[PDB]
Amino acid sequence: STTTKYIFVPIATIGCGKTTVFNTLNNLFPQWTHIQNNNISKKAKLKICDLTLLALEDDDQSVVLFDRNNSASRERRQIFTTIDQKRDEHLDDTVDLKYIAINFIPEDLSEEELWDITYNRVIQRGDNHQSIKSQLDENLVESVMKGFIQRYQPINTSRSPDDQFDHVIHLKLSKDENSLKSSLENVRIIIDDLVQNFPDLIKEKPADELINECFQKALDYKP
Numbered sequence: 001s002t003t004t005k006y007i008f009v010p011i012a013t014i015g016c017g018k019t020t021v022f023n024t025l026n027n028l029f030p031q032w033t034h035i036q037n038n039n040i041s042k043k044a045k046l047k048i049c050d051l052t053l054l055a056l057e058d059d060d061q062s063v064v065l066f067d068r069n070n071s072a073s074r075e076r077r078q079i080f081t082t083i084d085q086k087r088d089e090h091l092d093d094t095v096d097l098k099y100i101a102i103n104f105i106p107e108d109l110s111e112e113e114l115w116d117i118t119y120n121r122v123i124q125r126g127d128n129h130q131s132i133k134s135q136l137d138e139n140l141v142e143s144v145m146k147g148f149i150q151r152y153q154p155i156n157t158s159r160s161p162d163d164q165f166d167h168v169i170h171l172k173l174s175k176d177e178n179s180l181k182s183s184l185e186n187v188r189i190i191i192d193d194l195v196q197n198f199p200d201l202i203k204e205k206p207a208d209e210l211i212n213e214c215f216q217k218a219l220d221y222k223p
């Protein structure tokens, strides 16, 4: 009769944990399609929005993890506008699409600490963002990361375009201290939020051993 499907839209800069968190969630929930802008050729005729809608055509798909930074408000505007315009090419009128913002940069986080956490993650642990995956020029890494931060516009659901989100999940971002890693905390935040608010997506919280193992795999993942 009627189906609701979801597009999880991150708002992040480089090294905030976006790919790690989405890889963890896909490890846990293989039916949640993880579409990585970083892996799409720029001559490809199917761009991330096209692949998103193709994925949502499948009856077995309920969630697309839309893996792109979307640090600028114009980038969020593009998702809403393009998906809204193109969905009729792909989906019948019994499918309701909901957009879930996954906010990776807390309002309370200073730009200095955003830089401190993310730049040192990228240099110490690596990042597969294509323009910086080599890191043969640490000046280039700094310059690209600064570009995303310069363009970053915090989520604001009291105005266009972010008022089009149906739900926002607020993540944490902090320096690693002892065994604590904010990306694993954030996986749990997402799972708990969906268990409570979207039981159609997670009827029962997975065992903690499995959540932690899926996170370990994502943390260790090299492509």
Ligand SMILES: O=c1[nH]cnc2c1ncn2[C@@H]1O[C@H](COP(=O)(O)OP(=O)(O)O)[C@@H](O)[C@H]1O
Residues within 6 Å of the ligand: 013, 014, 015, 016, 017, 018, 019, 020, 021, 121, 122, 125, 126, 127, 128, 129, 176, 181, 182, 183, 184, 218, 219, 220
């Ligand atoms: O909570 C964390 N603590 C420490 N390092 C992390 C955490 N989450 C991800 N990382 C590491 O940070 C680096 C950047 O990962 P991220 O998921 O931010 O990539 P992204 O820029 O493609 O979204 C990776 O080497 C990853 O393993």
